[PDB]
Short mmCIF file of C-alpha atoms in Angstrom, two decimals:
data_model
loop_
_atom_site.label_atom_id
_atom_site.label_comp_id
_atom_site.label_asym_id
_atom_site.label_seq_id
_atom_site.Cartn_x
_atom_site.Cartn_y
_atom_site.Cartn_z
CA UNK T 1 -15.77 12.68 -18.46
CA UNK T 2 -18.13 15.11 -20.37
CA UNK T 3 -20.07 13.30 -23.11
CA UNK T 4 -18.32 10.18 -22.71
CA UNK T 5 -18.37 7.13 -25.30
CA UNK T 6 -18.23 4.17 -23.52
CA UNK T 7 -16.77 1.80 -26.83
CA UNK T 8 -14.12 4.71 -27.74
CA UNK T 9 -12.01 4.84 -24.65
CA UNK T 10 -13.11 0.58 -24.01
CA UNK T 11 -11.15 1.02 -27.31
CA UNK T 12 -7.81 2.32 -25.29
CA UNK T 13 -9.33 0.37 -22.04
CA UNK T 14 -7.81 -2.55 -24.93
CA UNK T 15 -5.45 -0.82 -26.21
CA UNK T 16 -3.24 -0.59 -22.76
CA UNK T 17 -4.22 -3.96 -21.39
CA UNK T 18 -2.81 -5.64 -24.84
CA UNK T 19 0.43 -7.15 -24.26
CA UNK T 20 1.89 -8.55 -21.97
CA UNK T 21 2.34 -7.17 -18.04
CA UNK T 22 -0.47 -3.80 -18.82
CA UNK T 23 -0.52 -0.19 -19.61
CA UNK T 24 -2.55 0.40 -16.04
CA UNK T 25 -1.56 4.02 -15.63
CA UNK T 26 -3.70 5.81 -18.12
CA UNK T 27 -6.63 2.97 -15.89
CA UNK T 28 -6.29 6.22 -13.92
CA UNK T 29 -7.01 7.27 -16.34
CA UNK T 30 -9.88 7.45 -17.71
CA UNK T 31 -11.65 4.48 -16.02
CA UNK T 32 -11.66 6.45 -12.84
CA UNK T 33 -12.90 9.91 -14.61
CA UNK T 34 -15.75 8.52 -15.36
CA UNK T 35 -19.16 7.75 -13.28
CA UNK T 36 -19.52 4.02 -12.59
CA UNK T 37 -22.93 4.57 -14.20
CA UNK T 38 -21.34 4.95 -17.74
CA UNK T 39 -18.38 3.08 -15.93
CA UNK T 40 -21.17 -0.25 -16.55
CA UNK T 41 -22.25 1.14 -20.33
CA UNK T 42 -17.80 1.11 -20.67
CA UNK T 43 -18.76 -2.67 -19.74
CA UNK T 44 -21.29 -3.43 -22.51
CA UNK T 45 -19.08 -1.52 -24.55
CA UNK T 46 -15.93 -3.35 -23.96
CA UNK T 47 -18.36 -6.50 -24.37
CA UNK T 48 -19.48 -5.75 -27.70
CA UNK T 49 -16.01 -4.17 -29.20
CA UNK T 50 -14.15 -6.33 -28.33
CA UNK T 51 -15.60 -9.58 -27.60
CA UNK T 52 -14.17 -10.72 -23.45
CA UNK T 53 -15.72 -10.00 -20.60
CA UNK T 54 -14.39 -7.10 -18.95
CA UNK T 55 -14.22 -7.14 -15.65
CA UNK T 56 -12.65 -10.16 -15.41
CA UNK T 57 -9.83 -8.74 -17.89
CA UNK T 58 -9.08 -6.48 -15.59
CA UNK T 59 -9.11 -9.35 -12.77
CA UNK T 60 -6.57 -11.48 -14.91
CA UNK T 61 -4.40 -8.65 -15.26
CA UNK T 62 -3.89 -5.87 -12.17
CA UNK T 63 -1.93 -6.17 -9.34
CA UNK T 64 -3.26 -7.61 -5.88
CA UNK T 65 -4.66 -3.46 -3.51
CA UNK T 66 -5.45 -2.15 -6.85
CA UNK T 67 -8.01 -5.36 -8.24
CA UNK T 68 -10.21 -5.25 -5.26
CA UNK T 69 -9.54 -1.24 -5.14
CA UNK T 70 -10.58 -0.77 -9.70
CA UNK T 71 -13.04 -3.89 -8.96
CA UNK T 72 -14.59 -1.96 -6.38
CA UNK T 73 -15.52 0.91 -8.91
CA UNK T 74 -16.38 -1.32 -11.43
CA UNK T 75 -18.70 -1.93 -9.45
CA UNK T 76 -22.33 -0.85 -9.82
CA UNK T 77 -23.57 0.40 -6.44
CA UNK T 78 -26.71 -1.96 -4.67
CA UNK T 79 -23.62 -5.03 -6.14
CA UNK T 80 -20.84 -3.07 -4.11
CA UNK T 81 -23.41 -3.41 -0.94
CA UNK T 82 -25.03 -6.69 -1.47
CA UNK T 83 -21.50 -7.77 -2.71
CA UNK T 84 -19.82 -6.19 0.33
CA UNK T 85 -21.67 -7.33 2.82
CA UNK T 86 -21.64 -11.15 1.58
CA UNK T 87 -17.52 -10.32 1.78
CA UNK T 88 -17.57 -8.91 5.16
CA UNK T 89 -20.09 -11.39 6.71
CA UNK T 90 -18.18 -14.04 7.97
CA UNK T 91 -14.88 -15.63 8.37
CA UNK T 92 -13.61 -13.93 11.59
CA UNK T 93 -15.25 -11.42 13.56
CA UNK T 94 -17.58 -11.18 11.00
CA UNK T 95 -15.50 -7.36 9.75
CA UNK T 96 -19.07 -6.52 11.78
CA UNK T 97 -16.96 -2.73 12.02
CA UNK T 98 -18.06 -3.45 7.32
CA UNK T 99 -22.17 -4.39 8.28
CA UNK T 100 -22.22 -1.46 10.91
CA UNK T 101 -20.75 0.22 8.27
CA UNK T 102 -23.51 -0.77 5.99
CA UNK T 103 -26.28 -0.95 7.52
CA UNK T 104 -26.41 2.05 9.42
CA UNK T 105 -24.83 4.12 6.46
CA UNK T 106 -27.77 3.45 3.65
CA UNK T 107 -31.63 5.15 3.96
CA UNK T 108 -34.24 1.98 3.80
CA UNK T 109 -35.41 1.84 0.45
CA UNK T 110 -31.78 1.64 0.19
CA UNK T 111 -31.28 -1.54 2.74
CA UNK T 112 -34.32 -3.73 1.24
CA UNK T 113 -32.93 -4.04 -2.52
CA UNK T 114 -30.08 -5.02 -1.01
CA UNK T 115 -31.78 -8.17 0.59
CA UNK T 116 -32.71 -8.57 -2.30
CA UNK T 117 -29.94 -9.46 -4.02
CA UNK T 118 -28.20 -10.36 -1.10
CA UNK T 119 -31.02 -14.30 -0.83
CA UNK T 120 -30.93 -13.55 -4.86
CA UNK T 121 -27.21 -14.14 -5.94
CA UNK T 122 -26.62 -16.93 -2.98
CA UNK T 123 -29.70 -18.36 -2.08
CA UNK T 124 -30.63 -16.99 1.73
CA UNK T 125 -30.85 -14.03 2.77
CA UNK T 126 -29.28 -11.08 5.12
CA UNK T 127 -30.58 -11.58 8.06
CA UNK T 128 -30.79 -15.52 8.12
CA UNK T 129 -26.72 -14.41 7.72
CA UNK T 130 -27.20 -12.70 10.44
CA UNK T 131 -28.53 -14.40 12.71
CA UNK T 132 -25.32 -16.76 13.79
CA UNK T 133 -22.63 -15.18 12.83
CA UNK T 134 -23.23 -11.97 14.92
CA UNK T 135 -24.55 -13.15 17.45
CA UNK T 136 -26.92 -12.28 20.66
CA UNK T 137 -27.36 -8.54 20.97
CA UNK T 138 -25.42 -6.30 18.80
CA UNK T 139 -27.57 -8.95 16.47
CA UNK T 140 -31.06 -7.45 17.36
CA UNK T 141 -29.63 -4.46 16.10
CA UNK T 142 -28.10 -5.27 12.95
CA UNK T 143 -31.51 -7.49 12.45
CA UNK T 144 -33.63 -5.00 12.40
CA UNK T 145 -31.86 -2.24 10.30
CA UNK T 146 -31.58 -4.99 7.65
CA UNK T 147 -35.27 -5.90 7.73
CA UNK T 148 -36.23 -1.86 7.00
CA UNK T 149 -38.79 -1.68 8.77
CA UNK T 150 -38.24 2.47 9.78
CA UNK T 151 -40.01 5.03 9.97
CA UNK T 152 -39.27 7.03 6.98
CA UNK T 153 -42.10 10.48 6.89
CA UNK T 154 -39.52 13.96 8.80
CA UNK T 155 -42.48 14.97 11.55
CA UNK T 156 -41.86 14.71 14.96
CA UNK T 157 -44.71 13.72 17.54
CA UNK T 158 -43.98 15.83 20.20
CA UNK T 159 -45.11 13.73 22.82
CA UNK T 160 -43.98 9.71 22.09
CA UNK T 161 -40.56 11.07 21.10
CA UNK T 162 -40.68 13.31 24.92
CA UNK T 163 -41.46 10.29 26.48
CA UNK T 164 -38.62 8.82 24.13
CA UNK T 165 -36.01 10.37 25.77
CA UNK T 166 -37.54 9.47 29.08
CA UNK T 167 -37.50 5.89 27.81
CA UNK T 168 -34.19 6.42 27.20
CA UNK T 169 -32.95 7.19 30.60
CA UNK T 170 -35.30 3.92 31.97
CA UNK T 171 -32.89 2.41 29.11
CA UNK T 172 -30.89 4.12 29.66
CA UNK T 173 -30.06 3.91 33.10
CA UNK T 174 -30.20 -0.46 32.13
CA UNK T 175 -26.85 -0.45 29.94
CA UNK T 176 -28.99 -0.34 27.02
CA UNK T 177 -29.18 -3.84 26.72
CA UNK T 178 -32.73 -3.95 28.93
CA UNK T 179 -35.79 -3.74 28.26
CA UNK T 180 -35.66 -4.80 24.60
CA UNK T 181 -38.39 -2.32 23.12
CA UNK T 182 -36.41 1.04 23.57
CA UNK T 183 -32.51 0.47 22.60
CA UNK T 184 -33.14 -0.24 18.96
CA UNK T 185 -36.95 1.21 18.25
CA UNK T 186 -36.01 4.62 19.82
CA UNK T 187 -32.82 4.68 17.05
CA UNK T 188 -34.01 1.62 15.33
CA UNK T 189 -37.48 3.56 13.78
CA UNK T 190 -38.16 6.71 14.11
CA UNK T 191 -37.25 8.87 12.32
CA UNK T 192 -34.83 11.02 11.53
CA UNK T 193 -36.70 14.01 13.07
CA UNK T 194 -38.83 12.41 15.47
CA UNK T 195 -35.11 11.17 15.66
CA UNK T 196 -32.51 13.83 16.83
CA UNK T 197 -35.88 16.58 18.79
CA UNK T 198 -35.92 13.51 21.08
CA UNK T 199 -31.62 13.76 20.92
CA UNK T 200 -32.64 17.65 22.07
CA UNK T 201 -35.12 16.31 24.82
CA UNK T 202 -31.63 14.04 26.09
CA UNK T 203 -29.59 15.98 25.77
CA UNK T 204 -32.33 18.05 27.55
CA UNK T 205 -34.13 15.26 30.34
CA UNK T 206 -30.79 13.37 31.25
CA UNK T 207 -27.64 16.47 30.61
CA UNK T 208 -25.68 13.81 29.18
CA UNK T 209 -26.17 13.48 25.89
CA UNK T 210 -27.02 11.34 24.59
CA UNK T 211 -23.32 10.98 22.17
CA UNK T 212 -22.31 10.92 25.58
CA UNK T 213 -24.68 8.37 27.57
CA UNK T 214 -24.64 5.76 25.08
CA UNK T 215 -20.53 5.81 25.10
CA UNK T 216 -20.33 5.11 29.19
CA UNK T 217 -23.98 3.01 29.53
CA UNK T 218 -23.00 0.81 26.01
CA UNK T 219 -19.58 -1.20 25.02
CA UNK T 220 -18.40 -3.52 22.29
CA UNK T 221 -19.88 -3.61 18.86
CA UNK T 222 -23.27 -3.02 19.76
CA UNK T 223 -22.30 0.63 21.00
CA UNK T 224 -20.45 0.84 17.76
CA UNK T 225 -23.39 0.25 15.70
CA UNK T 226 -25.92 2.04 17.93
CA UNK T 227 -23.71 4.91 18.71
CA UNK T 228 -23.14 4.13 14.35
CA UNK T 229 -26.75 5.15 13.77
CA UNK T 230 -26.39 8.74 15.42
CA UNK T 231 -23.38 9.78 13.75
CA UNK T 232 -25.24 8.77 10.55
CA UNK T 233 -28.50 9.90 11.48
CA UNK T 234 -26.75 13.48 12.90
CA UNK T 235 -24.11 14.14 10.27
CA UNK T 236 -23.57 10.74 7.60
CA UNK T 237 -20.30 12.06 6.49
CA UNK T 238 -18.76 13.08 9.76
CA UNK T 239 -19.11 9.65 10.04
CA UNK T 240 -17.05 8.17 7.10
CA UNK T 241 -14.56 10.31 7.94
CA UNK T 242 -14.03 9.25 12.08
CA UNK T 243 -14.50 5.08 9.56
CA UNK T 244 -11.79 6.97 7.25
CA UNK T 245 -9.51 8.21 10.20
CA UNK T 246 -10.28 5.22 12.15
CA UNK T 247 -8.49 3.15 8.99
CA UNK T 248 -6.02 4.83 7.50
CA UNK T 249 -4.96 5.36 11.90
CA UNK T 250 -3.19 2.97 13.70
CA UNK T 251 -0.47 0.46 12.73
CA UNK T 252 -0.03 -0.38 9.53
CA UNK T 253 -3.61 0.40 7.28
CA UNK T 254 -6.77 -1.53 7.97
CA UNK T 255 -7.50 -1.14 3.39
CA UNK T 256 -10.46 -2.67 3.37
CA UNK T 257 -12.81 -0.65 5.06
CA UNK T 258 -10.69 2.71 3.02
CA UNK T 259 -10.93 0.19 0.12
CA UNK T 260 -15.06 0.30 0.56
CA UNK T 261 -15.23 3.78 1.96
CA UNK T 262 -13.40 5.08 -0.50
CA UNK T 263 -15.05 3.53 -3.83
CA UNK T 264 -18.72 3.56 -2.54
CA UNK T 265 -18.57 7.21 -1.11
CA UNK T 266 -16.79 8.63 -3.96
CA UNK T 267 -19.81 9.90 -5.84
CA UNK T 268 -22.49 11.13 -2.53
CA UNK T 269 -20.39 13.41 -0.34
CA UNK T 270 -16.72 12.77 -1.17
CA UNK T 271 -15.81 17.34 -0.88
CA UNK T 272 -17.78 16.37 2.30
CA UNK T 273 -16.72 13.89 4.07
CA UNK T 274 -13.91 16.02 3.31
CA UNK T 275 -14.16 18.94 5.42
CA UNK T 276 -15.51 17.05 8.18
CA UNK T 277 -11.67 14.99 8.57
CA UNK T 278 -9.87 19.10 8.12
CA UNK T 279 -11.65 19.76 10.96
CA UNK T 280 -12.13 16.83 12.74
CA UNK T 281 -8.51 16.15 11.71
CA UNK T 282 -7.01 19.03 11.50
CA UNK T 283 -4.76 19.07 7.70
CA UNK T 284 -6.52 16.92 5.04
CA UNK T 285 -7.96 13.25 3.91
CA UNK T 286 -5.99 13.58 0.98
CA UNK T 287 -2.71 13.51 2.40
CA UNK T 288 -3.95 11.41 4.99
CA UNK T 289 -4.49 8.86 2.24
CA UNK T 290 -0.65 10.41 1.09
CA UNK T 291 1.60 9.00 3.03
CA UNK T 292 -0.54 5.65 3.99
CA UNK T 293 -0.77 3.71 0.48
CA UNK T 294 1.67 3.11 -2.43
CA UNK T 295 1.74 4.16 -6.16
CA UNK T 296 -0.91 4.19 -8.72
CA UNK T 297 -3.15 2.72 -6.22
CA UNK T 298 -2.97 5.82 -3.92
CA UNK T 299 -3.10 8.12 -7.11
CA UNK T 300 -5.90 7.42 -8.03
CA UNK T 301 -7.54 7.17 -4.57
CA UNK T 302 -5.66 10.76 -4.37
CA UNK T 303 -8.39 11.55 -7.06
CA UNK T 304 -11.61 9.26 -5.32
CA UNK T 305 -10.69 11.66 -2.90
CA UNK T 306 -10.62 14.54 -5.77
CA UNK T 307 -7.28 16.80 -4.50
CA UNK T 308 -5.85 18.04 -1.33
CA UNK T 309 -6.26 20.92 1.20
#
């Protein structure tokens, strides 16, 4: 909020938590209305102003889904990224959907810090953890991205770029699983300027847009990420929305994802994602999140959304 005081409102985060039960309806009407920076500032305050460690108290009196979400809002940015990718990183199927929605989506200086922390917090790095838990070819894409060796200068190299689209047909006809230099690099190496412009010469050299062809040559998780990168690097909020739709859709809700997206993306482009949902899925994301959730769990999300229409 405008002119915030960590300790003062932190005295309410305590007042409300006080006594068996909790006044959760007001947690949203303080915590969900601050920026993250200010939230962690609440943390500083609740430490010295109360004396217990806030994050745990939240986590020692809040129920289920409302804990993973308030938690996400209460966590600092890179640590939502590091701790998330960790969460995602093994079990069954490695929620490679998250490793697809945590790598493609961050910029190269953004991915790099996160490696340093997934090493640090735990002991051994992202790519190490990637190599077992993700496999074979799709692994490659992930390995490339987690390193972060990607061109940052917005610049079009008209020849290698025109050559690259040429190659994406070469390594277009061979499932994109041949000559492990194109599909990976061409997408996971050259700056969005050089990238989309080859995306001008593939819609030309090939008459079949790079999108379509990625789906009709390639298949599976590989395809998900290769194709994730195209969405992130053409319009990132249209992918965060494609994801949203792609969580809240279907039998039941695939909570976790929508949780990490809602929490995370909440402060970069939610009024942007939202437009690419009004058109893309002819309705609002608000209302999508309205019928597919419960009480103050939905209610705080109707605020990480930020409203209807």
